[PDB]
């Protein structure tokens, strides 16, 4: 029912190897829909989902102009940040920015985001109010003073409450076949002997969309959080995701263990056990 649109941007400097590489991608929920890479032979924003292909040339021209301009401002920003941190011009550095909006079932703004990181560390973020800033350090306070003076937050609020939510509504409708379809996990339990004394039970969730899922093991009805190996949810490459959770079970105890699965495509949570 709830949805999100996010744009991600990364610039990475490479002194002596030309200008910083800029890569930006856009997502609705867990679906990639646009990309731009300054190292492409002829950089243009390109479609990555079928429902964005119908946007006309004016959209692609505008988006491409925005991406090219952002690549250039990021290069200026990388030069500025070397000054703010008293750094030399010899090393590679990273500048990241994410922004976008979350909406609920009725399409209304739930919250907006616009935040930056430098060298993998939080730098400055627009607060949930869309009106004030959180700066991580005294360098970012210099940016905060500039952005307060220029009323940047007001510009971001206008976009996040307005255009961002309106684009997301449009995309959700044009992409209603897929963006508004949850694919439930296909689930099963496997058993993997380790020694005469114990075996692994592995609970699998495959083919699901969106990525959010909860997979847990209980023993005699008690959660086994500390003893569960839970891998990161991972992309299958066909739009869907995979996950598994594994516990080490003493011989003969297998029926005391239950795997529990929660996903928005399931009308009710599932309980599974090993079935020899």
């Amino acid at each position: 029912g709830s949805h999100s649109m996010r744009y991600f941007h990364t610039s990475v400097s490479r002194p002596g190897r030309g200008e910083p590489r800029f890569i930006t991608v856009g997502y609705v929920d867990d679906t990639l829909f646009v990309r731009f890479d300054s190292d492409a032979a002829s950089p243009r924003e390109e479609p990555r989902a079928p429902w964005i292909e119908q946007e006309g040339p004016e959209y692609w021209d505008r988006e491409t102009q925005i991406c090219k301009a952002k690549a250039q401002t990021d290069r200026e920003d990388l030069r500025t940040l070397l000054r703010y941190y008293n750094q030399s011009e010899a090393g590679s550095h990273t500048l990241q920015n994410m922004y976008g909006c979350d909406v609920g079932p009725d399409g209304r703004l739930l919250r907006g985001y616009h935040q930056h990181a430098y060298d993998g560390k939080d730098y400055i973020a627009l607060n949930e109010d869309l009106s004030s800033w959180t700066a991580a350090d005294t360098a970012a306070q210099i940016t905060q003073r500039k952005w307060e003076a220029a009323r940047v937050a007001e510009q971001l609020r206008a976009y996040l409450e307005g255009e961002c939510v309106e684009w997301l509504r449009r995309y959700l409708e044009n992409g209603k076949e897929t963006l508004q379809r949850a694919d439930p996990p296909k689930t099963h339990v496997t058993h993997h002997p380790i020694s005469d004394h114990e075996a692994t039970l592995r609970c699998w969730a495959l083919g699901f969309y969106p990525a959010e899922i909860t997979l847990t093991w209980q023993r005699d009805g008690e959660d086994q959080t500390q003893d569960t190996e839970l891998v990161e949810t991972r992309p299958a490459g066909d739009r869907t995701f995979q996950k598994w959770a594994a516990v080490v079970v003493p011989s003969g105890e297998e029926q005391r263990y239950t795997c529990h699965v929660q996903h928005e495509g399931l009308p009710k949570p599932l309980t599974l056990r090993w079935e020899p």
Binding site: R62, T80, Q155, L156, Y159, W167
Partner: peptide, 9 residues
């Protein structure tokens, strides 16, 4: 669709 506001640190 993207934000079109140039913003420099």
């Amino acid at each position: 669709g993207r934000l079109n506001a140039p913003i420099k640190v």
